[PDB]
Chains A and B, each alone.
With several copies, the nearest count.
Chain A
């Protein structure tokens, strides 16, 4: 069965981003599209599930030279007294049947938390203690001692934008959408490329797919710089270099892990 074709038809226009990126991977003819998907009323329904007799009657009386309004009409249509009680008992039983369809912790080193990841003679204490004890025999010098006009102005000037302690562009708009779309494409493909990269996966069938994905990295990064070139030759302003870091770091991881694999071999 063409289940893949049916799914592609379903998602062809319902979701714009998914199909946009999947098509983009083919617009420049990067790779085959197989890997793309390889890696990744109420009343009548209630009656249908309630009355098996109604189900059989519907199957035998499927609309044939009749009308659904007439079928609806057929629904509602001491001997009668006991029939009502029996009907409730049977109906509740049918509803119920339809619903019943088949370590104490111990530690040896706690001061490590007291000094967590945050990083980092005797007569001196005596001298400082006595000196500070004798320091404050006089108090309330606020009248002049606390502040002076010259020092006050210098702080003002420092607080000024050009002073110390106080250091002090949305021109492009349409380029924003293009950058977002490119970032989404990079994320989409990096997801599969990094899906099993961190795990060692020392198996033949597991490593085959990482090798294929690593080649796909070359093949996609082949086309990325061409769009980069198109965008660059406009104004030579507002450089977009963050995208380069992702590609270069992915390449560095690829090559370093290749060298590590060769060393392990």
Chain B
């Protein structure tokens, strides 16, 4: 899915604009390339270039890496993280949970998505009270079930006013929040 989206953006002019706006780095299955790309991404975050790191939620990089102040400032989540519905291993794992312990298949699937999203979006608040915003570009997260299964600390901060902001409104509120975060305690 990441490759398809990247290819579509490349065919259109959005990607060239994105590269001009800020350096762009992408993740690959190979660990060597992943490590090199992340090493350059850190320097970009330090140097004036800045960086947009595209990765996969299930990618080992997402779990291994930790984002701190001036690292992964704004965490963008493109789509609810769901595993493919064809891998037969998950079919056993899921239908057995339905049969025993009485967990609905949809319930467990949404739980597996929300837990993964929280894992991959909760890094920006590592410590030392470093500001940062977590934007989820998916109307599915606006659903009550996803919000309810979301961790309490994020959900309570989340409000109905900004629950389903348009793209432009989200951009404006992000700019304003970054302004407020800028400046001392």
A residues near B (Cβ < 8 Å) are: 81-82, 84-86, 88-89, 92-93, 95-96, 99-100
B3, B24, B44, B49: the one within 8 Å of A81 (CB): B3
Contact in complex: B26, A85 (CB < 8 Å): yes
> Given A86-B28, A92-B23, A92-B24: A99 and B6 within 8 A (CB)?
no
Nearest-neighbour CB distance to chain B for A51, whole angstroms, equals 15
B residues near A (Cβ < 8 Å) are: 3-4, 6-7, 10, 19, 23-26, 28, 33, 36-37, 40, 43-44, 47, 49
Q: In the complex, what residues of A have CB within 8 A of residue B4's CB? A: 81
B7, B43, B47: the one within 8 Å of A84 (CB): B7
A82, A86, A88, A99: the one within 8 Å of B24 (CB): A88
Contact in complex: A82, B23 (CB < 8 Å): no
Q: In the complex, what residues of A have CB within 8 A of residue B37's CB? A: 89, 93
Q: Interface on chain B toward A: helix, strand, loop, or mixed SS? A: helix
B10, B26, B33, B40: the one within 8 Å of A96 (CB): B40
List, sorted by A's number, 22 A–B pairs whose CB atoms are closer than 8 Å.
A81-B3, A81-B7, A82-B3, A82-B28, A84-B3, A84-B6, A85-B3, A85-B6, A85-B26, A85-B28, A86-B28, A88-B19, A88-B24, A88-B26, A89-B25, A92-B19, A92-B23, A92-B40, A93-B37, A93-B40, A96-B43, A96-B49
Nearest-neighbour CB distance to chain A for B2, whole angstroms, equals 8
Q: In the complex, what residues of B have CB within 8 A of residue A93's CB? A: 36-37, 40
Nearest-neighbour CB distance to chain B for A114, whole angstroms, equals 39
Contact in complex: B7, A89 (CB < 8 Å): no
A81, A88, A96: the one within 8 Å of B47 (CB): A96
Contact in complex: A84, B28 (CB < 8 Å): no
Which 6 A-B pairs give the minimum distances between C-beta atoms? A85-B26, A92-B23, A81-B3, A89-B26, A93-B40, A92-B24
Q: In the complex, what residues of B have CB within 8 A of residue A88's CB? A: 6, 10, 19, 24-26
A81, A84, A95: the one within 8 Å of B23 (CB): A95
Chain A residue nearest to B25 in the complex (CB): A92
Contact in complex: B43, A89 (CB < 8 Å): no
Q: In the complex, what residues of B have CB within 8 A of residue A82's CB? A: 3, 28
Q: In the complex, what residues of B have CB within 8 A of residue A100's CB? A: 43, 47
